[PDB]
């Protein structure tokens, strides 16, 4: 595949994707173990004025990954931007 | 045991050779240093003159029988690349080395059902006999004894793995530039490392011969200079290029306009003196970007000097062009820890892992023979004895995110000593780390500085939807950021150019009525964007496209927005400010360079939106702000509303864990399903937010007040729907559920229209929403808005490298990839046309 067609392919499934988000259920649940299993990120940043996505990702760990983040052992370190702002710009108080 | 260290004697009648054994070798053989001298009788004061002819070849001779196992040989070209016998790494290779150097990885340990990972610092062990044989040849001529080894840096190159154990790793090496100092001879060589074929890190190797050398002759400087990226968006510059003699072109009415050129620059630099360079030759290929994101040669840089004082093509480029990675600092230094490390009564435990024989590490006699005040301590070991503590800290006890690694040696260390390493973070590469250590002994003198590029963790961003609306969100951040300045003015600008209304104005003071002027010229180009804008509903069940804005023609003059209390609580200004200051927020973290490179991302709703214009920027700032206000002006006129405003449709937060502890994700989509065909009114579980505990569902006002009263009914019953069904009777609850709701959904029609939707045990109603997004409501609005992504989503600006992987969708959920089967899943969950035109011609897009 050429890097030109493969662009328009990329192009195509992004219009449709965008168009059906109003258009097709939000399957949150199961994106959350994308991030949370198929990849194992240690940083869930929110992006937001308030932790709408933050307390959906810890109670998802809480839930059904207290048994998995003990038989790899990695810590998880689940933040927002409006909220711990201190801790991803790493300025900490003297 | 009492060996002997030195033999005495006269070798001839007027030669004294005095002798020095060393023990510790390969081959457990003892090697002679014979350092001749010249007794002369007839000068009296000083009769002991140093045979100074045929000196440096015999320390040679002494060093590589420690260093190099193969055969004795100073007749090779320094500029002409040095290759070393393929070296592997196993299981002991790591225990003895990390015990050695106290590197407590346990990824270095040996895990069940996981490779054994290396020391970044083993692969000076792995190339040691590649890099050292650079400074052999009899033109690169100096004393071992008092060769200080200045720097020693690691590059774990962008995408390949660090080293594991079995890999069989090669080690090559070619030497950068040699260059006569006043003080002596610094040689810089790079040593990299290739498993596979493939490299795998750049070992940066400063060697520095004090000393007088005359020979520069033999001095050469073949740097391969960073790549230098620079836009062409005048028709200023281009005439500065075109001037340029070195920038020569393969097509000379090339269009460099709007471009953007990479330089793939390597200068090779002879000398005449240590300032004055005798030949300059700056070459390499200039990369324009097209619009695939693809790098393609279209020139080649081809500069050619005699007598110059400096690079013009880099001089030029670096002021002209960036780097490709520009770091920034912190706006304060992190004073990580004050941490104490103690280098080891002994310098063998080192000495045999590497396979470095230094004697100045080992025999006191070598040791002060070089004016050393003892058995130097390998300055290697010290930088795996401090990289140890930086892999134990900034990296959380990982080996990954190790790139790259440079540590200077300043001072000279004896054994058994006191060290203070002072780790300082500084400022951000491109989301990496940059960590400045600075060791002390116990005297308070610097010993070690240098620093280490860390990679981050990997890293997931997630945009939040709509949710919270509130005045002045992001105006602290737009205040201070200059980012955050550029996103809003840009928005702005945009808004006021094409809609006739100012963002800013909106989240600062939440007018309740704004009127909409389109009063001139520049007037009726916003009044045409404006009955530009199409929507299509189902009356009568027709496909037929109505228009937004019902009351603008082209005899309108003026539109007013109204509100009850301000603008900010309708969803058509509420969503452009919160995709605002999120895209702003992650602009602000891209300014301070905190965004990993291969980092996922997972939009939510709209934040899907914000996800793919900040990780991917396929749509300009100016293109997301318009598409978020037409989905939320399609997502307003998309249900019918009385005259007040008020539509029948509306939210719940479900909370399953509330109604039943055995309740499951399977009956809460079974009692939606079972209530949609029995009441016959649109619900349906439009967010999969959290299992169990917090869904959304969108529908009829009517239809979300009979699965609440099922869910009161069900927990004062206590009787569960996936037990009774198999351990019961078969598709006997699917006719005692219909009665449930049957009950639930006739007193759910009494009511008026605009019916108070009640929160219950397990529902919670959303309020400020009466439209069914994310349901099959608007199956029939969906098609104007492919018309409407088309102009604004340009196909030259989405990049597949910057999206596989990594944007996740909220559709499929599954990291995005350009296959027939991701397409089929997409056609699958939503039936479109274009997927399948696709599908069926997959193989004619193959070839």
Redesign the interface.
Same mark, same amino acid.
Request: negative net charge.
């Given at each position: 595949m050429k890097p030109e067609v493969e662009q328009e392919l990329a192009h195509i499934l992004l219009t449709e994707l965008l168009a059906y988000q109003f258009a097709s259920p939000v399957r949150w649940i199961e994106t959350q173990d994308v991030f949370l299993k198929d990849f194992n990120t240690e940083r869930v940043v929110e992006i937001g004025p308030s932790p709408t996505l933050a307390g959906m990702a810890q109670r998802t760990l809480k839930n059904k990954y207290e048994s998995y983040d003990a038989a790899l052992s990695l810590h998880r370190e689940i933040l927002c931007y409006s909220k711990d702002a201190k801790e991803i710009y790493y300025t900490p108080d003297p | 045991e009492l060996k002997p260290t030195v033999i005495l004697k006269l070798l001839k009648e007027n030669i004294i050779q005095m002798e020095m054994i060393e023990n510790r070798t390969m081959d457990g053989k003892p090697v002679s240093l014979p350092l001749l001298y010249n007794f002369n009788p007839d000068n009296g004061f000083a009769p002991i003159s140093e045979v100074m002819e045929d000196r440096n070849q015999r320390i040679k001779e002494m060093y590589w029988k420690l260093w190099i196992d193969e055969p004795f040989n100073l007749d090779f070209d320094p500029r002409d690349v040095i290759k070393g016998k393929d070296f592997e790494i196993t299981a002991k290779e790591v225990y003895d080395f990390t015990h050695a150097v106290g590197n407590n990885c346990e990824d270095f340990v040996s895990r069940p059902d996981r490779t054994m990972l290396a020391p970044m610092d083993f692969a000076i062990v792995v190339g040691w006999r590649a890099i050292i044989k650079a400074i052999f040849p009899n033109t690169v001529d100096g004393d071992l004894l008092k060769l200080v080894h200045l720097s020693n840096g690691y590059k774990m190159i962008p995408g390949a793995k660090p080293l594991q154990v079995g890999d069989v790793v090669s080690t090559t090496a070619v030497i950068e530039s040699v260059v006569n100092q006043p003080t002596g001879k610094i040689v810089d060589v790079v040593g990299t490392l290739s498993r596979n074929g493939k490299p795998v890190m750049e070992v940066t190797s400063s060697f520095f011969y004090r000393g007088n050398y005359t020979d520069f002759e033999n001095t050469f400087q073949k740097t391969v200079e960073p790549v230098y990226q620079m836009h062409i968006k005048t028709s200023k510059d281009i005439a500065v290029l075109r001037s340029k003699e070195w920038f020569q072109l393969d097509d000379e009415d090339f269009d460099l306009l709007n471009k953007t050129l990479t330089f793939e620059t390597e200068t090779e630099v002879t000398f005449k003196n240590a300032n004055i360079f005798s030949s300059v030759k700056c070459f390499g290929p200039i990369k324009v970007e097209l #619009?695939?994101?693809?790098t393609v040669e279209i020139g080649i840089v081809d500069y050619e000097a005699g007598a110059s004082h400096g690079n013009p093509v880099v001089d030029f480029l670096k002021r002209n062009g960036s780097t490709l990675e520009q770091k920034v600092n912190?706006?304060?230094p992190?004073p990580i820890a004050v941490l104490d490390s103690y280098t080891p009564s002994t310098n063998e435990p080192y000495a045999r892992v590497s396979g470095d024989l230094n004697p100045i590490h080992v025999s006191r006699h070598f040791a002060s023979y070089a004016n050393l005040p003892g058995t130097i301590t390998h300055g290697m070991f010290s930088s795996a004895s401090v990289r140890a503590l930086i892999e134990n800290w900034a990296a959380?006890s990982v080996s990954s995110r190790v790139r790259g690694y440079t540590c200077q040696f300043v001072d000279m260390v004896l054994p058994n000593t006191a060290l203070k390493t002072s780790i300082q973070?500084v400022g951000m590469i491109n989301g990496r780390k940059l960590i400045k250590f600075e060791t002390r002994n116990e005297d308070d003198v610097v010993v070690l500085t240098g620093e280490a590029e860390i990679e981050? #963790?990997?890293? $997931?961003?997630?945009?939040?939807?709509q949710?919270?609306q509130?005045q002045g969100?992001?105006m602290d951040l737009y205040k201070t950021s200059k980012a955050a300045q550029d996103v809003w003015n840009r928005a702005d600008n945009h808004f006021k150019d094409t809609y006739g209304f100012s963002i800013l104005d909106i989240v600062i003071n939440n007018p309740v009525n704004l009127t909409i002027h389109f009063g001139g010229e520049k007037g009726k180009r916003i009044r045409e964007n404006y009955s530009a804008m199409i929507f299509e509903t189902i009356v009568d069940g027709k496909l037929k496209t109505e228009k937004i804005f019902k009351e603008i023609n082209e005899h309108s003059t003026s539109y007013t927005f109204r509100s009850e209390k301000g603008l900010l609580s309708a969803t058509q200004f509420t969503q452009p400010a919160?995709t605002l200051?999120?895209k702003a927020?992650?602009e602000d973290?891209k300014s301070?360079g905190?965004i990993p490179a291969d980092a996922?991302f997972?939009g939510?709703?709209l934040?899907?939106?914000?996800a793919?214009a900040?990780l991917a920027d396929?749509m300009s700032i100016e293109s997301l702000v318009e598409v978020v206000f037409y989905?939320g002006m $399609?997502?307003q006129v998309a249900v019918p509303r009385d005259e007040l405003g008020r539509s029948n449709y509306g939210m719940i937060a479900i909370n399953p864990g509330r109604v039943a502890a055995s309740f499951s994700?399977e009956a809460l989509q079974y009692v939606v399903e079972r209530v949609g065909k029995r009441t016959g009114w649109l619900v349906?579980?439009?967010?999969?937010?959290?299992?169990?505990?917090?869904y959304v569902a969108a529908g009829d006002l009517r239809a979300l007040d009979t699965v609440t009263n099922v869910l009161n009914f069900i927990k004062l019953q206590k009787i569960d729907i996936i037990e009774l069904q198999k351990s019961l009777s078969l598709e006997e609850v699917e006719g005692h559920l219909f009665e449930i709701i049957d009950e639930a959904s006739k007193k759910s029609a009494v009511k008026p229209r605009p019916l108070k939707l009640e929160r219950g045990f397990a529902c919670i109603p959303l309020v400020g929403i009466s439209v069914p997004?994310?349901?099959?409501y608007?199956?029939n609005?969906?098609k104007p808005?492919?018309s409407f992504?088309?102009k604004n989503?340009?196909?030259?600006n989405?990049?597949?490298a910057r999206?596989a992987g990594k944007?996740?969708?909220?559709?499929?959920?599954? #990291?995005?990839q350009?296959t027939k089967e991701?397409?089929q899943d997409?056609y699958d969950?939503?039936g479109?046309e #274009?997927?399948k035109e696709?599908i069926d011609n997959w193989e004619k897009?193959?070839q």
């Open positions: - | #619009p695939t994101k693809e912190l706006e304060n992190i959380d973070h981050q #963790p990997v890293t $997931t961003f997630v945009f939040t939807g949710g919270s509130e969100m992001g919160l200051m999120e927020a992650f973290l301070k905190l996922t997972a939510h709703s934040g899907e939106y914000a793919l900040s396929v989905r $399609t997502m994700q349906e579980i439009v967010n999969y937010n959290v299992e169990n505990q917090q997004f994310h349901s099959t608007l199956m609005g969906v808005f492919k992504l088309k989503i340009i196909k030259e989405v990049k597949v999206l944007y996740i969708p909220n559709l499929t959920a599954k #990291p995005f350009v991701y397409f997409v969950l939503t479109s #274009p997927i696709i897009y193959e």
